[PDB]
Structures are given as C-alpha cells and as structure tokens.
C-alpha cells in the first residue's frame, strides 16, 4: 500500500443473500474497484487497497459494521527519499575508518 494500487487481504463470507449490498472503504483514502460481488455462496475476497499501514484495522461491511482485523509489517522496501541519509556517532571512533584501502 501507499503509492502502489494493489494489496492482498483475505475476506470471507458466511452469506446466502441474492446480492451483496453496498459495502464500504478502508482507511488512508481507499476507493476500491469492488465492494459488491455475488454473495449467495461461500466465496473469499482477495481485496486490494492503498493503505500500507501497520495496525490494519478499519470499518468495512455491507453489514459487517466495523470489524477489526490486525496487521504487522516490517520497514524494508525500495527507498527513494529526499533528505540526508544518516547522522550518527561516526566522529568518535568510526570516521577513522571512512578512508579505506582502495
């Protein structure tokens, strides 16, 4: 989630109604390409989002009415940033190793 458009959450239904009514959106500005599908059967929903957050709990039910899922994520991906890389304690005993054997 974030810049990219597609995520993967497994949504499951115990439903038999003829058609699923209007569901709702996730957080972080999500307008999905689908909130309704056939609902008379037991079919999973591989939902895609734009969130890219950690808690991963938001309100999204035709009638589910704000169920709370959970999420946990690492911090490692491609890094395209703007500001300075890092300021650290190299001056004490690590700046001496800056100039190395070329």
């Amino acid at each position: 989630g974030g810049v990219r458009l597609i995520t993967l959450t497994s949504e499951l239904k115990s439903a038999t109604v003829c058609a699923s009514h209007f569901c709702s959106s996730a957080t972080s500005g999500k307008k999905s390409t689908e909130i309704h599908f056939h609902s008379g059967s037991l079919v999973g929903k591989a939902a895609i989002h734009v969130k890219g957050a950690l808690v991963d709990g938001t309100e999204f039910t035709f009638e589910g009415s704000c169920m709370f899922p959970d999420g946990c994520n690492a911090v490692d991906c491609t890094f395209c940033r703007e500001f300075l890389k890092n300021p650290q304690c190299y001056p004490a005993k690590k700046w001496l190793f800056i100039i190395i054997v070329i």
Binding site: A19, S24, S25, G29, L54, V75, D76, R81, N86
Partner: protein, 433 residues
C-alpha cells in the same frame, strides 16, 4: 485531526442561568480547509470564562462523483388493451353524422360513470358493416365506439431524475458537542446546505473539474441493478425520449388513477376490424430503446448555538513511528481525571492541536502526528501547569536498518576518483598546448 482552528471568542452571548454551569449562545460562520480524504476533522471553542472548553468534530470518508436531482419521474409498464362496443344503426339512436365532440371521460354509450384501467383512452366513430349479413337490418354503416387502456399488469417502476452535469462530492459526519452524531449526503461542489441540529455546512474547494455526457440514474424498485439512460427529460414528454409516460406518484404507480401520470396521444396503435378494433403499442420498453450502457475547504455556518460550561496527570506512554507520511504516527496517552473534560494545545510540538475529550476514570487516547525528533512542551489541558517530555526517534523514508547493504555499496562507491585526476593531468596542459 492535524487540521483544526479554534473558534472566535469575541462573539459571546452568555446568560448565567446556573451558577455551576454557565449557559452560552454563539452564532456566525466557519472557514476551515478540507483534507485529503479519510480522516476526522475537529473544531475547538473557547469562552471568556476560564475553565470550560468545547469541541466539534467532522468526519470525511469518500471522494465520489454524483449530481443533484432536478425532478423525479415515475414510469409504469404500459400494455395495450382495448374494448369495442358494437352498436347497430337505429339501436341507441346512433348519430347518422358522427359528432366531433366526444365525452371521452364519461362514455355515455357504455357506463357513463366507472373507474377504468385507462389513462383516458380516446374514442372514435368507425364505419362498420351494414346489411342482413352484418345483422343490422339496414344498409347503413354500423356504429362502433371504442376505448384505450394504458395499464401495468405487474408493477415495476423507476424513479427518474436528470442532472445533465456532474459535480464532485464527499461524505461528511457531524459530532455535536452535546454528543449527538449525524451524517447526510454532502454535495461539496455546489453550495448545498443542511439544516439539522443548530448549524449548517456547505461546499469545499472545486479543485478538479471534468466533462461528461448528460445522463441520469435508473434502478428498479425491486433492485435488479442500477443503470444509465440518455433520459432526455422535461415536464412534458417528446416523442422517442427515455420516458414517454411521466408520473410523480408512487401511490398511483402500479395503478393509474391520478392524472398526474401524464401521457401523449395515440401511443397505443389501433387497427380497425369489421366487428371490433385491434390495439397494438407504439410505446417502447425501459431497456435498450436508446440505452448505450448499464453498469460500469469544507466550511460551515453557525446558528444560535446552545453551548454551556479539575485534577489531572501526565499520563504519557509510548510512541509510534512515521514522518513525511500524510497520515502520521499515533501516540498513546493513558489518563485518569476528575471531570468529563477536554485538552488543549502545546508549545513545542509545532505540528497541530490536541483534540481529546475524556471522562472521570483511567482511560487512554491515541493521536497521530509526525516529526523528526520528539519535543512535546507546554500541554495545557485541565488548567494546571503540566508539561511532559518523551525522547524518541521517528520513522522516515530512511535507510535500511536490516541489511546495511548501502554501507557496503556506498563504501565501494568511491572508485577511481584521484586516478581520473592524475592520468588526465598528464594530457591536460599538453593538449592545451
């Protein structure tokens, strides 16, 4: 809510009805920006009275394109039917010359008074057979009168409304400082108003505009599916448009008794017969007749309000991490206090204001911000001089802490720097010479 601006403390109309609880009234208007969607905005209020403060919150959910409804229309399922009354000459004293005037709403020939399944079906004289073979004991042409019914056998009807334009809108929820919650259909491009509670709100900035063809909605009352119709419309009905039978009555939708359900002449087509007449329909259906498709600074106005009139702690705890991200990073705060009261801004944060409303027990709150290093001074919430400090390093789009492959790559990044300055210097002045 990183976005919030306090109220104005100069418009004050307070009457001291109760000594413990001051009673105040304020009105006016509000001017606040709008967020990129998916959060909840707040609105803080003050008073010349020192202790009490109040707040109002606004939630935003979606960005979407819908438009206004100019006028609603209903269309039943018209079906052709007809009856003919066969009258011989000299029986009923038929008009040897048919009179152009007709009592079409009575039918004095056949039951001058009766409710019919008809939308005022027209009547016409016709030249029937004459003679003994026709059984009229006369060579004079027969005397046949007729009636049209416009009827719906089984009722499926559609509410029809045109916009012929499209303006962006959103979703807005209201939180009354008393505690009431309200939402509606906000139309945030055109200055629509909502009149509920005590106050009124209206549009946001028209950042984006687009052009789209003039179209409508359509959807079954039994909800087959939504769809889209050219839906050319007016108070009356032109030939070949999307709705030829205009009605505004769901009560008279299935059956047609009120004249509000309007029509046009001779949509139902008639074929004459020697003894009777045969009726067919030139009317069209609801689908595919011309269809080309199926399914694919928010601010407020302030009325005369009713807004009326502690021991606390530091209650701080841990931090979450994100910076330069438009959402932020939450911080948890676990308070117990003595009044069902609120909190207010700090000095050193330089990010936004506090929006916290708590009660009399140990609770906890979470609020999202973003920073480089964590500073947090001067939070004046309960009126007491309390300040709290936490030192932490916040997440940014930062280097990789796991692999440190950049520390390997950047170390090897320096290559042949002085060599390019040494060999090229051997042919620098000579080439210049």
């Amino acid at each position: 809510c990183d976005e919030m601006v306090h109220a104005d403390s100069k418009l004050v109309s307070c009457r001291q009805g109760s000594g413990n609880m001051k009673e105040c009234v304020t009105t006016g208007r509000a001017l606040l920006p709008a967020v990129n969607p998916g959060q909840e905005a707040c609105l803080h209020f003050t008073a010349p009275g020192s202790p009490d403060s109040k707040c109002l919150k606004i939630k935003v959910k979606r960005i979407n394109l819908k438009c206004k409804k100019s006028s609603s229309y209903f269309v039943p399922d018209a079906r052709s039917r007809c009856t003919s009354v066969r009258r011989c000459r000299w029986a009923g004293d038929c008009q040897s010359g048919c009179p152009p005037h007709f009592t079409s709403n009575s039918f004095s020939d056949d039951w001058a008074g009766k409710m019919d399944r008809a939308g005022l079906g027209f009547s016409g004289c016709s030249d029937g057979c004459g003679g003994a073979a026709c059984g009229c004991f006369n060579a004079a042409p027969s005397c046949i009168f007729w009636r049209k019914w416009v009827e719906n056998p089984h009722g499926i009807i559609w509410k029809v409304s045109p916009c012929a334009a499209w303006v962006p809108s959103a979703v807005i929820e209201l939180t009354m400082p008393s505690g009431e919650v309200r939402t509606f259909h906000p139309m945030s491009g055109i200055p629509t108003q909502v009149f509920k509670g005590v106050s009124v709100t209206y549009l946001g900035s028209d950042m984006e505009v687009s052009g789209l063809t003039d179209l409508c909605e359509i959807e079954e009352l039994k909800s087959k599916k939504l769809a889209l119709a050219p839906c050319n419309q007016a108070g009356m009905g032109v030939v070949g448009k999307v709705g030829e039978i205009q009605c505004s009555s769901e009560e008279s939708a299935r059956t047609i008794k009120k004249d509000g359900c309007i029509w046009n002449a001779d949509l139902v087509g008639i074929e004459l017969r020697v003894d009777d007449a045969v009726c067919y329909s030139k009317i069209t259906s609801v689908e595919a007749v011309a269809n080309y498709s199926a399914i694919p600074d928010i601010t407020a106005i302030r009325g005369s309000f009713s807004v009326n009139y502690a021991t606390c702690t530091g209650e701080v705890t841990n931090v979450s991490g994100c910076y330069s991200c438009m959402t932020g990073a939450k911080v948890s705060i676990k308070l117990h206090s003595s009044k069902n009261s609120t909190a207010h801004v700090r000095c050193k944060g330089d990010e936004t204001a506090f929006s916290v409303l708590e009660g009399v027990h140990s609770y906890t709150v979470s609020l999202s911000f973003d920073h480089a290093v964590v500073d947090e001074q001067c939070q004046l919430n309960c009126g007491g001089h309390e300040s709290q400090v936490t030192l932490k390093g916040n997440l940014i789009f930062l280097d990789v802490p796991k692999f440190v492959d950049g520390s390997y790559m950047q170390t090897y990044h320096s290559t042949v720097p002085t060599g390019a300055n040494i060999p090229s210097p051997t042919d620098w002045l000579n080439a210049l010479f």
